[PDB]
Every structure is written in structure tokens, then in C-alpha cells.
Design a protein around this ligand. Structure first.
Ligand code: HEM
Ligand code: HEM
Ligand SMILES: CNCc1cccc(-c2cc(C)cc(N)n2)c1
Ligand SMILES: CNCc1cccc(-c2cc(C)cc(N)n2)c1
Ligand SMILES: C[C@H](O)[C@H](O)[C@H]1CNc2nc(N)[nH]c(=O)c2N1
Ligand SMILES: C[C@H](O)[C@H](O)[C@H]1CNc2nc(N)[nH]c(=O)c2N1
Ligand SMILES: [Cl-]
Ligand SMILES: [Cl-]
Ligand SMILES: [Gd]
Ligand SMILES: [Gd]
Ligand SMILES: [Zn+2]
Lengths: 401, 401
């Protein structure tokens, strides 16, 4: 009942005892495996109790002093109000633990290093905007990127929700034409359609930074133009392919996910944007080369005079490596923090080992940890992984419309 | 009914065929073990009952004359003998089906074009060897490879199993070295040692083809050398890197897996070697670049003048891509069937469509279907998949030593 986990490069074996804690049921049954799919009153007290017992054991404070104390004041807080507020340190410990538990995150070696901005006293979209702008400018930090999460007020009934309607704080526009097809990013066509539907002047280009749609409780959302000086972008050039610059490609510095629902101790914050720094294959492989994304693969391959007539020339593979080389080169030249998929996976192997020592395991979604290029060249490929849900966590959540 | 999205297009289907998944896999709602490499007359009757049902569905004669008799026949035979015998056409259909049902085979567009050699009358290790040479000979076909399988006598009470001890009909010796390392293929150290123990005179090259260890029932395994001219190999060169030929690398033409058990209607064939043709990534990425295999990646990158001192230069990705180029080119130059990961994955997408119209789904192991380089460059990356066990099937089995 303790999963045997092997690494096929070294031969080492470990057991994931930590898997025994899994709260929210996963999508997989004995009869079918759905791991490859992307999106598969006083119950609050169970999750509240568990999270507090975590915190105190983590500060080597099990069964003493403030432990039983803090247990009572949340027993009382929920008793009176039907909810509870987190101690500042707990909201910090929960944000760090959610990141620690995100199975699909390959950068969790960094999980202990996170800056939590507390926006729990937020009211109105104009309020979030400055909180977001503080985060953004803090996280960006002139390119020396720093992980951060801004936690907006939790959720209560009879009130609306705090929601950032964008999936990320920096997203590129996507525009249709007299022929349906898209200029810009097709992953944002919808929110790009909303932003114009809420009165934003649409640009022309293929790299217009979208305006934020911020929503305050029980209130239709307000458009916000991000300060251009606040959106650090990296023009993409290639170290030795002088024409790559001419392709006019750019990506933004800050990967800030603004659509996931932080969940700590049974409290659900539908607006808790977190941000780190990119891994280069996110940009160079998925964002630019996915056929439903910028789909630049063939364009770059033409410019390299590759043979696009036969699949076995590996022109796709060759042009994709160069797009990734441009990404890493351009971010480094702009001194923007970025990590290549080799460095990143190797650190994750280091993380798995730390977590084996610390908590006897680590929930890891194999298919998202293995990078989208050069899979078996990175060690995580040869590492078996166990996927389960631990709390606290980042969860997906419905689009706020 | 699991809903399955294709993210490249937006396609959405529901895998109704998963509902017939008979045997159980390793995943629970608690934890996903997808990424793990290695996850009574009445039961023999229901398996047989079902397969016979299957077979009569395929010949468009479901519930017909022959259908009832075969059920009662098989039951009377199982009652009388404890087991039953497949008719030859049932055997051809159960070997094709077991390839159809193989979740980890990207090459399943070919599942109906399968040459089934009935060796169920085999009598000794020696006859076994002859059947196998004729399999290799038929399949290799001078480089125009043909998919084939030889079904040796089924497991049955009172007699031990036929076994091919070798994991594949063509394998390269792996000699543990003086200084603790391996010469040849490290994946084949065990089987090499067994051969030597069984009186094989070892070589000392890197691409020494292994002898066959063939076990007739209730017999020690017997050692059989393959005629050199039966084992078509391909010397590896690069279309532009001319120093590449000086690496002395070779791979063989025929991927013939010989250690898997073939299951049809509850009957078990512990020896049924099957062969297709290679997908270049198996050779180019896995076999040559896995750190625990031939592990050539650094030597190629050094020879390529790549900067191997930083990972951000993507020297691993660049060097791997040219190794795969070399494999593809070397095999086309030698007129030996080979499919690249772009072509293979694109025909597997057709397979999934054909299988959806045919059976309402298709068992697929994403982590095995997605190639180990350039994953998201291929369409199967952006296809969600439902992995489950159908029968007939190729199963793993314990090594007979
Ligand atoms: C510091 C460097 C970081 C790196 C290099 C990194 C990298 C990644 C990558 C490559 C993914 C895969 C997602 C995709 O490809 O779509 C991912 C997912 C994820 N990351 Fe991290 N990340 C970092 C920091 C963080 C932080 C600070 C948080 C939160 C506090 C976080 C939370 C998550 C979550 C929840 C997911 C899963 C989201 C989803 O399923 O869409 N990451 N990360
Ligand atoms: C004709 C062209 C074929 C191609 C291109 C092909 C391709 C592949 C590949 C790439 C794998 C993954 C193996 C690995 O990555 O190590 C695989 C696995 C597998 N294939 Fe195919 N294959 C072909 C033919 C066949 C045939 C003829 C059969 C059976 C009659 C078959 C049954 C299987 C099975 C059972 C597995 C899983 C073996 C394992 O789990 O280790 N394949 N195939
Ligand atoms: C193409 N990836 C989209 C995507 C989807 C979800 C999350 C990320 C993410 C989040 C963070 C904090 C860092 C990072 N490097 N990535 C990215
Ligand atoms: C790195 N491959 C090892 C391996 C392991 C298991 C199966 C294969 C296989 C089998 C067949 C019939 C065709 C093919 N193309 N591959 C290969
Ligand atoms: C269909 C498949 O599950 C889906 O495309 C997943 C696979 N792995 C991934 N891995 C990462 N890091 N990001 C992704 O978007 C995906 N997509
Ligand atoms: C540990 C991990 O599951 C293992 O290396 C798997 C991953 N996916 C694979 N996919 C294929 N096709 N072949 C393999 O050998 C593997 N190995
Ligand atoms: Cl992104
Ligand atoms: Cl192989
Ligand atoms: Gd030119
Ligand atoms: Gd040359
Ligand atoms: Zn699973």
C-alpha cells in the first residue's frame, strides 16, 4: 500500500508514504487512468483543524502552547461566524505549502522562497489593481525575478467573489479577421473578446498586452490598463541567426497565474495570483510553437532554410531547439530570470530527494514535469512519480462568467 | 464516460470503450501511478466467453450458428481438459487484437497488417529456434520490414512454459568492464551474463549481437547463435556530420520483443515474439542517449563543438536531434523501414480516430505514446488519453531466471 517508486537512470527505489494523506479524490480508477487530462456547512472545520496541525508540526510545535490555543480560536471563529481568518503566518505557511504541493509545478525546489503579499483587506477593483501592480513590480524587480503571491480576501456567502478574469496578469491579445483566423495569441481570443466587449481599444499587432479585467464582489468588472513601464518584456533574438530579431517576436518577463483558487485550511481565495519566473520551454516551445498558439515553427524553419518537405528531416525539431535558444539567449541578455528545462528538471530531482527526506514523497504529475522538448534528456523523464492531491493546494476554478 | 479533449484543435470525444476495461490497473482515486513502468476454471471461462464473443463480433456473425457451438465447445473442453485450444483464425484475430489493445504502442495504425505464424505445434528448443529464424527472416525482408508474430505453445497444466529468455530477439551484449563500467548495452548485462553462464563465448565489442536463450518446457534454457546474415544491422552515419561514422555506432533493423506474454481468451502464450519496425526515437534518443544506455550524447555534443559547459546552450537538445537525424538517414540509406516520431504520432492520431468510430475509444498510455524528444511538437502531446487494460493483450511476465 506504499507505492514503490523507481528511477530508471540510477536504479534507486523509494516509497511514497506521503501519498497516504491524499484528500481530494483524483480522476483515476483501477479501471482507467486519466492522468493525462488537464482539467479532470461545518465541513470547513475538518480542513481547518488539519491545516493548523500541519503548521505547528512544521514549526516543531506539536501538542503545546499556541497549538491547542489556535485550535480553540478557530473552533470559536467558525462557531460564531461560520468561517475563519488566517493568522498572517499561517496564510504564509499555506501559500508556501500549496506551491510545495502543486504536482504539475516543476520549480518547487524554490517553494520555501516565496513572498506573500496580504490583500485580505481588499475592497473594489481599483484596490486589487494597485495590489496587483505592487506584486508585478515587486515580482518583476527589474528582471531579477522574485516569486510572489498576492492573496485577496477569502470567500463568504452572500458576497460576490474576488476574481481576476485573465488567466495571467500578462497576456497577449488575440484578434480575429474577415476569415476567423487570429493575429496575436489564440489562447486569449476569448478574454481578448471580453476586454473589447468591456470597452478597450484593440491594437493592431501580434504582441499587444491585454488590459486586466478585475472584478470586485457582487460587481461587474472594470477594465485596467497596466502601466507599460510595468510590463517587462524581452524582445526575442537569436545569438547567431541574425534574422530571428526581424521576426519581431517578444514574450513577457513575469509568469503570473491569475485564475487559480488558493485553498488553505478550507478557506477558498478565488483571487490569489502567484508568479515566479519562466522556464524557457514554456515560452519557446509551448507558447511560440504549439499549433494553436503562436505556431511559429514553420516560419522559423523557412528562415533557417530547413527542409520542411519531409518530416524525417526533423526540421520541426531543429527549428524548435533554436526558438528555445533564442528565448534563453534573449532573457539572459535582458537579464531577466529564466531557467532552461535541463537546469529546471535537475533541480526538481534535487527537490524530489529533499521531499523524500522531509515528507517521504512528493506529488508529481509526470506528464507536466517532463518538459515539452527533449523529455528523456532530462532526468525527471526516467523518474517514476506519484500523483495525488494534498492540502493546501492551488485548484482550478470555473471561469467567472 | 471519460471525456477526452484534443487541445490542438478543440476536439472532444468520450471514451466509452474504457467501460469494458476488464483487468485492473494501478491507479486509484487517491493516487495516480500512470508513470510507473511496471504497474480457477470459471474465470478462464468468462475470459474465453468474452474473447469468443469478440471474435464472432469481428466476423460479423455475432450470435450466429458457429457462435453458440464455440461457447459450448470451449466450456465442454474447459470442463474436460481444464483448458481449450484456439482455432487458427481465432488465433490470428487474438494476436491482431492484442496489438490493437497495447496501450503503449504508437505504431498501432498497423494493427491489422500483422503476419501470424502459428508455432503452437513447436516441440523443442531446437524447433523453436527454427521458427524464430524464419520469423526474423520473414520480418526483416531485406529491410522492407513486415510486422509479424510467432505464437509458441500456450501455457497448459502439466508442462512448463516455452520461454525466450532474451527480452528481444536482437540485443547487444553488455559486458561489465574491468573498471566497473559496461561495454555495449548496459540494459543487457543480465542476459549477457546468463548467456555466458550457459556457455556462450563472449565477445568484447560494443555491438555484439546476443545469442538466444530458448527454454523448452521443463528444460534448462538452450543457447542458439543467430546466423550473422539473419541479423540485418544498420551502420550509423550522419548526412552532414562525416565524423559521425567514426563513432562505429550500429543498430539492428528488427525490433522483436520476445519476453512478453500474449493473452487470448484466458489462454496464456508465454513465448510469442512480435516484431514491427523501429520509430527512430527509440534508437536515436532512448537507446543511444539514455544516461544508462549507450550514453553518447556528450560525446556527440563535444564532437559537434557545442558548448557542453552550460545547459542553457541546449547542447543536449542539439546533439540529440542530430543523433536522431543520423538514425533516420542511416536507415533510409540502408533501405530499412523506419518511421520518425512526427510521422508515427500523426498516424497514431489517425488510429485514435479510426478507433473512436470503431470501438468508442482506444487505450493509450500518454507517457509512452508521446515521443521522448519534441513531445509537444507532435500531435499526440495535445491529445488527452484514457489508459486501461483490454484483452487480448500483451502483458509483462517475470523473467524465468
Ligand atoms: C520560481 C520558479 C517557477 C518555475 C520555473 C515554475 C514552472 C512551472 C511550470 C513549467 C509549470 C507547468 C505549467 C504549464 O506548462 O502550463 C508550472 C505549474 C504550476 N506552478 Fe510553478 N513555477 C515556478 C514558481 C511557482 C510559484 C511561486 C507558484 C505558486 C506559489 C507555482 C505554482 C504552480 C502551479 C499551481 C502550477 C500548476 C498550474 C496548472 O496546472 O495550470 N509555481 N510551474
Ligand atoms: C509496425 C510498426 C511498430 C511501431 C512503429 C511500434 C512502435 C512502438 C513504440 C515506439 C513502442 C514504445 C517502446 C519504447 O518506447 O520502449 C511500442 C511498444 C509496444 N508495442 Fe509497438 N510498434 C510497432 C509494432 C508492433 C507490433 C507488430 C506489436 C505486436 C504484434 C506491437 C506491440 C507493442 C507492445 C506490446 C508494446 C509495449 C511493450 C512494452 O510495454 O515494453 N508493436 N511500440
Ligand atoms: C505555458 N505555461 C502556461 C502556464 C500555466 C500555469 C502556470 C504557469 C507558470 C506559473 C508560474 C508561477 C511559473 C511558471 N514558470 N509558469 C504557466
Ligand atoms: C526503445 N525501444 C525498446 C522497446 C520496448 C518495447 C517494445 C518495443 C518495440 C516493439 C515493436 C514490435 C516495435 C517497436 N518499434 N518497438 C521497443
Ligand atoms: C493532453 C495533455 O495532457 C496536455 O496537452 C498536457 C500535457 N502536459 C503538459 N505539461 C505542461 N507543463 N503544460 C501543459 O499544458 C501540458 N499539457
Ligand atoms: C519513469 C518513466 O515512466 C519511464 O522512463 C517511461 C516514460 N515513458 C516512456 N515511454 C516510452 N515510449 N518508452 C519508455 O521506455 C518510457 N519510459
Ligand atoms: Cl505562459
Ligand atoms: Cl529497442
Ligand atoms: Gd536566405
Ligand atoms: Gd560536414
Ligand atoms: Zn492514473
Amino acid at each position: 500500500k506504499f507505492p514503490r517508486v523507481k528511477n530508471w537512470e540510477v536504479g534507486s527505489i523509494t516509497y511514497d508514504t506521503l501519498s497516504a494523506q491524499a484528500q481530494q479524490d483524483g480522476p483515476c480508477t483501477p479501471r482507467r487512468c486519466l492522468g493525462s487530462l488537464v482539467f479532470p456547512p461545518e465541513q470547513l472545520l475538518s480542513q481547518a483543524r488539519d491545516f493548523i496541525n500541519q503548521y505547528y508540526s512544521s514549526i516543531k510545535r506539536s501538542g503545546s502552547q499556541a497549538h491547542e490555543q489556535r485550535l480553540q480560536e478557530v473552533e470559536a471563529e467558525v462557531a460564531a461566524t461560520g468561517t475563519y481568518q488566517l493568522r498572517e503566518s499561517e496564510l504564509v505557511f499555506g501559500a508556501k505549502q500549496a506551491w510545495r504541493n502543486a504536482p504539475r509545478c516543476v520549480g518547487r525546489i524554490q517553494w520555501g522562497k516565496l513572498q506573500v503579499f496580504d490583500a485580505r483587506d481588499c475592497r473594489s477593483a481599483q484596490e486589487m489593481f494597485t495590489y496587483i501592480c505592487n506584486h508585478i513590480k515587486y515580482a518583476t524587480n527589474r528582471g531579477n525575478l522574485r516569486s510572489a503571491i498576492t492573496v485577496f480576501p477569502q470567500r463568504c456567502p452572500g458576497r460576490g467573489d474576488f476574481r481576476i478574469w485573465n488567466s495571467q496578469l500578462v497576456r497577449y491579445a488575440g484578434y480575429r479577421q474577415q476569415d476567423g483566423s487570429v493575429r496575436g495569441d489564440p489562447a486569449n481570443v476569448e478574454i481578448t473578446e471580453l476586454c473589447i466587449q468591456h470597452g478597450w481599444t484593440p491594437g493592431n499587432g501580434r504582441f499587444d498586452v491585454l488590459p486586466l479585467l478585475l472584478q470586485a464582489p457582487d460587481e461587474p468588472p472594470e477594465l485596467f490598463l497596466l502601466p507599460p513601464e510595468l510590463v517587462l518584456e524581452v524582445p526575442l533574438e537569436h545569438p547567431t541567426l541574425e534574422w530571428f530579431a526581424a521576426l519581431g517576436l517578444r514574450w513577457y518577463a513575469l509568469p503570473a497565474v491569475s485564475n487559480m483558487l488558493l485553498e488553505i485550511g478550507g478557506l477558498e481565495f478565488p483571487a490569489a495570483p502567484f508568479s515566479g519566473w519562466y522556464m524557457s520551454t514554456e515560452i519557446g516551445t509551448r507558447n511560440l510553437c504549439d499549433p494553436h498558439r503562436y505556431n511559429i515553427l514553420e516560419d522559423v524553419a523557412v528562415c533557417m532554410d530547413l527542409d520542411t518537405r519531409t518530416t524525417s528531416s526533423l526540421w520541426k525539431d531543429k527549428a524548435a531547439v533554436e526558438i528555445n535558444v533564442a528565448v534563453l539567449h534573449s532573457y539572459q541578455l535582458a537579464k531577466v530570470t529564466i531557467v532552461d528545462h535541463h537546469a529546471a528538471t535537475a533541480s526538481f530531482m534535487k527537490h524530489l530527494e529533499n521531499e523524500q527526506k522531509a515528507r517521504g514523497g512528493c506529488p508529481a504529475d509526470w506528464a507536466w514535469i517532463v518538459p515539452p522538448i527533449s523529455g528523456s534528456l532530462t532526468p525527471v523523464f526516467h523518474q517514476e512519480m506519484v500523483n495525488y492531491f494534498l492540502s493546501p493546494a492551488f485548484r482550478y476554478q470555473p471561469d467567472p462568467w
